[PDB]
Amino acid sequence: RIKKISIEGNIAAGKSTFVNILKQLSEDWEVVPEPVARWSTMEQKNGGNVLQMMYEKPERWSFTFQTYACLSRIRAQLASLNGKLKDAEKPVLFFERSVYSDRYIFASNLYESESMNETEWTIYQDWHDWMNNQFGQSLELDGIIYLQATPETCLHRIYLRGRNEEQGIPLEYLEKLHYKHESWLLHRTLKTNFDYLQEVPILTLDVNEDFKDKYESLVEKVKEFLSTL
Amino acid sequence: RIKKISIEGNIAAGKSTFVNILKQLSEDWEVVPEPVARWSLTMEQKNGGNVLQMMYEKPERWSFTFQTYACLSRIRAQLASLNGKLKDAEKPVLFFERSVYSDRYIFASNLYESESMNETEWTIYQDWHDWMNNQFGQSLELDGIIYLQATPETCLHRIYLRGRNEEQGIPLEYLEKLHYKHESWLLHRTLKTNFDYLQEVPILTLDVNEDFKDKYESLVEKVKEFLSTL
Numbered sequence A: 001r002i003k004k005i006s007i008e009g010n011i012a013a014g015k016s017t018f019v020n021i022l023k024q025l026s027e028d029w030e031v032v033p034e035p036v037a038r039w040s041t042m043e044q045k046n047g048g049n050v051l052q053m054m055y056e057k058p059e060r061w062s063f064t065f066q067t068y069a070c071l072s073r074i075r076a077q078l079a080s081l082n083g084k085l086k087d088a089e090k091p092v093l094f095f096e097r098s099v100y101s102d103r104y105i106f107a108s109n110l111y112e113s114e115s116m117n118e119t120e121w122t123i124y125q126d127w128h129d130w131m132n133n134q135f136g137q138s139l140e141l142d143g144i145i146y147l148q149a150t151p152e153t154c155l156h157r158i159y160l161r162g163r164n165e166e167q168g169i170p171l172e173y174l175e176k177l178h179y180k181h182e183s184w185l186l187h188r189t190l191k192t193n194f195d196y197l198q199e200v201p202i203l204t205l206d207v208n209e210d211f212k213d214k215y216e217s218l219v220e221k222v223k224e225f226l227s228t229l
Numbered sequence B: 001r002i003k004k005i006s007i008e009g010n011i012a013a014g015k016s017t018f019v020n021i022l023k024q025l026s027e028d029w030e031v032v033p034e035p036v037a038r039w040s041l042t043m044e045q046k047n048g049g050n051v052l053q054m055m056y057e058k059p060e061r062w063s064f065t066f067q068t069y070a071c072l073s074r075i076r077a078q079l080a081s082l083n084g085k086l087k088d089a090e091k092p093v094l095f096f097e098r099s100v101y102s103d104r105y106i107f108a109s110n111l112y113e114s115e116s117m118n119e120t121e122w123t124i125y126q127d128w129h130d131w132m133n134n135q136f137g138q139s140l141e142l143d144g145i146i147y148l149q150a151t152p153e154t155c156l157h158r159i160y161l162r163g164r165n166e167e168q169g170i171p172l173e174y175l176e177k178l179h180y181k182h183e184s185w186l187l188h189r190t191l192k193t194n195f196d197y198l199q200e201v202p203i204l205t206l207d208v209n210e211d212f213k214d215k216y217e218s219l220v221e222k223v224k225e226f227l228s229t230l
């Protein structure tokens, strides 16, 4: 009965801005933020190092990082289903990215750029599949909100944000991520190994224009979209 | 109602052999062979054969990745056995070849203590281990442990006897440290363990220094007296 909605989008496309604006509109709406975003406690401690290790040599840490990101995400998402929104009439939990983006956007891309060998990729996939076929329908998504944007907007938004460890992220990586987003979410040409994702509605929203003070139209779409599910 | 007994000991102490003796002795007794031994067809084998070989070559690079996939395959494979067979047995016993506690408190810990995992790999693995057993590995809880005790010397010979090409390069020095962590876990019961029920589980210790392959009957009697105390 709690609807599960994932917000997807390239680095710095404004997802955390969005979902924070959303948290403020409905007492009936909650947010699960991305743990890597949190890294960017023991987990908080482990995530810091592994994120810094990922930046300084990705071919060494990609497997470790991708398995830890996902597990940290799976336990924050499970926790909020048990923890937040308890007696709500129309419960919606918004996820800052998903187990699917973890694997079919980010981990797939890292494989393609040779930062994980085959053994690494099918170990990761094997692990991601056994486990993501253990929770019946409990994390499965009611729909997806694709925050569509350009890499230069995104590149611009990294400078403005001002995480110094990110101030090296080049355009072309951001450019790689986008095609993968656009390929999966927009032209819808990327079959997963998950059954229901074929019949999973998708709202795309243009976030190239700035929205911290002009979001009503975007939000109107989210409520419009939410009433079809 | 299945009873779950962990068979524990060093590399080439005789676990695989005793486990194949036991299984034939009753229709109520079955075994879950340890993934890592089959890795030395299925995609798990391919990954397994691959990462094990990488681990031989470069353990400082591969131990986390190895440890993670060996534990996962174990939990997986133990589940398949526990929710598969022994529906009909009146006195069902499942003998596991090693445990998730072996994986962690012998092998992972030794890799961490030998600097083949780093503080973050090992802390991430421990966090991963805490959680993976508790989301999925809960009915794998153990009733007993059987330690097959064999000197580091015994194994190297037996390693030579079993004759795998990869194993022959393993040094007495390695058998020594893994030899030393077994004792503290299961004899002294030195080992602090996150799983508090684990400090209370009955252990049985069996010296397996002589060829017991022809002549296993007294070992089998000690197992049998243990199983009815459980």
Ligand SMILES: CCCc1sc(-c2ccc(OCCO)c(OCCO)c2)nc1CSc1nc(N)cc(N)n1
Pocket: A034, A036, A037, A040, A054, A055, A056, A057, A058, A066, A069, A070, A101, A102, A103, A106, A107, A109, A110, A113, A115, A173
């Ligand atoms: C700070 C965001 C986390 C990072 S860091 C990182 C990365 C850092 C340095 C990199 O290169 C070093 C010089 O080539 C890098 O390049 C990978 C080669 O294609 C990726 N990619 C990422 C995106 S991978 C990722 N996986 C997830 N599962 C979630 C998520 N948010 N990000």
Ligand SMILES: CCCc1sc(-c2ccc(OCCO)c(OCCO)c2)nc1CSc1nc(N)cc(N)n1
Pocket: B011, B034, B036, B037, B055, B056, B057, B058, B059, B067, B070, B071, B102, B103, B104, B107, B108, B110, B111, B114, B115, B116
């Ligand atoms: C069948 C043995 C599998 C291997 S291979 C291996 C190993 C091989 C070569 C090694 O070094 C030679 C190159 O420097 C090596 O050194 C480890 C350094 O701490 C370990 N350790 C092991 C034991 S780790 C282990 N973890 C498990 N979880 C299960 C299991 N059966 N074994």
Ligand SMILES: O=c1ccn([C@@H]2O[C@H](COP(=O)(O)OP(=O)(O)O)[C@@H](O)[C@H]2O)c(=O)[nH]1
Pocket: A009, A010, A011, A012, A013, A014, A015, A016, A017, A018, A157, A158, A160, A161, A162, A209, A210, A211, A212
């Ligand atoms: O309409 C917007 C959306 C985002 N940003 C900025 O873009 C940066 C990245 O946004 P966010 O942290 O939400 O990115 P994401 O969560 O998608 O990585 C932040 O500094 C935002 O303040 C902005 O100035 N106007």
Ligand SMILES: O=c1ccn([C@@H]2O[C@H](COP(=O)(O)OP(=O)(O)O)[C@@H](O)[C@H]2O)c(=O)[nH]1
Pocket: B009, B010, B011, B012, B013, B014, B015, B016, B017, B018, B158, B159, B161, B162, B163, B210, B211, B212, B213
């Ligand atoms: O009493 C024994 C115990 C073991 N072995 C041999 O020693 C090797 C190692 O035994 P096993 O594979 O059972 O050891 P594990 O690695 O399973 O502990 C094998 O070739 C066995 O046939 C033996 O000849 N007599």
